[PDB]
Amino acid sequence: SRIEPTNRAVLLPLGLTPEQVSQARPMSRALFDALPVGPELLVPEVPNAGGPATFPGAPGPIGTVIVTPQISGPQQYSLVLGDGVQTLPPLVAQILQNAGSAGNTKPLTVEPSTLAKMPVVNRLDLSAYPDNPLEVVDIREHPSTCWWWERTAGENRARVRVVSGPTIPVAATEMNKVVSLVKADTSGRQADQVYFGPDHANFVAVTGNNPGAQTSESLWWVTDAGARFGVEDSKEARDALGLTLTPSLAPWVALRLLPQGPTLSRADALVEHDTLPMD
Amino acid sequence: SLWWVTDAGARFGVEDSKEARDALGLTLTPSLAPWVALRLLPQGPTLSRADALVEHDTLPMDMTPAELVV
Amino acid sequence: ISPPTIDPGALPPDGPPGPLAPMKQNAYCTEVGVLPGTDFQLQPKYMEMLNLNEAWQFGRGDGVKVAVIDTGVTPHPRLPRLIPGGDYVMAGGDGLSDCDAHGTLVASMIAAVPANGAVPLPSVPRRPVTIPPDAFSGIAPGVEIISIRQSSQAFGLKDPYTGDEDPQTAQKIDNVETMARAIVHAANMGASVINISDVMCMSARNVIDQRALGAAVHYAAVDKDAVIVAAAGDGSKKDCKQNPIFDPLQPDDPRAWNAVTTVVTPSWFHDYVLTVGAVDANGQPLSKMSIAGPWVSISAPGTDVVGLSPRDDGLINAIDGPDNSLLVPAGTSFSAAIVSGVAALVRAKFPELSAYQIINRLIHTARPPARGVDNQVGYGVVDPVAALTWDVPKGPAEPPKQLS
């Protein structure tokens, strides 16, 4: 989710600092495409702000913050809209007061008896903001972050998570057998290193990146050296190579990063050469 | 100049240096042949240690091939 | 066959729509219906691949004008933003009634508005037919649709003699000329996405002169910055026959232009037109139904079609065939409709980009086939959320300098 360093009203209640945000580290193009996009962290846009209310007894103009006294139990914040009032989470009320301050620092305190007469309404979306302060990780101690996708055989949903650590999530003993690739493509859409851990998959079928995708669009073969080769989906090619078996699923965001070799097909191999060139 | 001819009818050049000889074998003395005949065979790249030390992800495809008929 | 060439001096002069010669209606309009046992409360199977619930977060495509050059459109309470553009089949028409059932299906698949307790326009003033609670919704409900009636099967010439040219080929030359005119007219209307879902197949043997159509395509794509999307052509149509694919013995041209046997137009102009092939609801190509030409560039679904009914006020699944048989629609004419919706949403989110750049954004984010680039499907299957969020390079595709 996107955030701007100029918006002191939002940075402060969340627990962020303008300097801390400006000193954030880079992000790779590869990981930028993998993570799904969420709504922006901005001040809520209350509609028709400042006008008079439609309902009787409204404590103030539309868009003002209301609270109830502590002597009657834990305090519940609320917002007064045109046709009624809608509840506010604690963390958002702080943002509305700070941003909509214009010099004001506190809400209007109203008793339950007068509150109980106002009709309840729900007219604005507010689920984007967290309900408590952000536990921002200090990047110097965890310089590594990954997007993780997994799907269990027989399931209808894939699981998407983020992992952070001091180093890539591989066993310390196996760290020596990561393969370093050549890199002809300079567009930044090809990886630098590849690792084949336990229970890896050789024969794969491409699928959508969202967690609810069900298609199976094409077949590929991934070699121990890191390159991927395409397989023509025909009875003769499958049986000649020995691939009459069911392939495992893979997402395109992860698979697209391996270098692509020539296609495997019976017609492509029935050719003779005197000598091979070297471009 | 030194040349190596394969059973497939292709010819490859070999470096004169001790390294290239000692690495492939080829220590024995070569037989003589006339250039007007030897030049008629198709040529491949020379076997020099200086150019075998390279890495690749994929190789270039060969233009103008011929059909293998069963 | 050599790839197309263009002479921009041949642009047709602008003018109000009207046929080249007087025509009369020869047949009754096609009846429509629903297949036995359907339940419109479930989503169409094709919408699962598109993941629309996540793509709509950035918006519904508000403020975009899409031109539908086809067999016209009949108004319905779920299409509140329809505009009459013109008619080339009948001199007195305006493009706002379809006698063939084709046009309202294609238009409704792009912009039909979702269900609600009450419709915005409850009035129903639509005219009669001429003689001689619900899960369905369009891909971009916010668009504005312009209707132009370019072709129909139900009409014919009322002085059938055509002289020294065979009456079969004489009709193709009239279509090519009338197609160029509609593209120029649709661009001057200010449309930003032009959708073409009816196309001509021709023999490679003595192709018809297209100078007027070539210039018309260039003007709309460059000087008016419109995105042109066209269907690859259904293999059930009168003259369309299948084209050969890549040949490993001749790596000279990887798209195989020298082996072409059937030409599809305006789809032929791969430098300015985006051509869409078809795949089933699971992702396999409809190998038996779409023409695999060398101009194909992308693909999208084409089965389990659903749409608003002409001549009624509800949904439909099939159209009344020649016999009593009830025939179900499928094919590229509908896949091109899906891409017209995705193209409309993308150039609502990136309004600074030109037509040539929007096309590159869709091409680079699609899931590719085993050969990387093929003819049955172009670069791959369209992907909406990917097109709207990944960081695509602004330049066209380029090969690496050296691989060693």
Q: Structural class of the helices, strands and pairings of chain A?
A: alpha+beta
How large, in whole angstroms, is the Cα Rg of chain A? Answer: 28 Å
Q: Count the E strands of chain A.
A: 13
What proportion strand of chain C? 15-25%
Question: Which sequence of strands runs across the widest sheet of chain C?
Answer: 4-5-3-7-9-11-12
Summarize the amount of helix of chain A as a percent range: 10-25%
Q: Can you count the helices of chain C?
A: 8
Give the CA-CA distance, first to last residue of chain A.
Answer: 45 Å
* Number of helical elements of chain A: 8
> Could you state the order of secondary-structure elements of chain A as H and E?
HHHEEEHEHEEEEEEEHEHHE
Oligomer: part of a larger assembly
Structural class of chain C: alpha/beta
EC number (chain C): 3.4.21.-
Family (chain C): Belongs to the peptidase S8 family.
GO molecular function (chain C): serine-type endopeptidase activity
Main location (chain C): membrane
Word description of this protein:
- The structure is cut from a larger assembly and holds 2 copies of chain A and 1 copy of chain C (404 residues).
- In chain A, the strands form 4 sheets. In chain A, strands 3-2-1-4 form a 4-stranded mixed β-sheet. A 4-stranded mixed β-sheet of chain A has the order 11-10-9-12. Chain A has a two-stranded antiparallel sheet with strand order 5-6.
- In chain A, helix 1 runs antiparallel to helix 4.
- Helices cover 17% and strands 18% of the residues of chain A.
- In chain A, strand 5 and strand 6 form a beta hairpin.
- Chain C is an alpha/beta fold and 404 residues long.
- Chain C contains 8 helices and 16 strands.
- The radius of gyration of chain C is 21 Å and the shape is globular.
- At the B-C interface, strand 3 of B face loops of C.
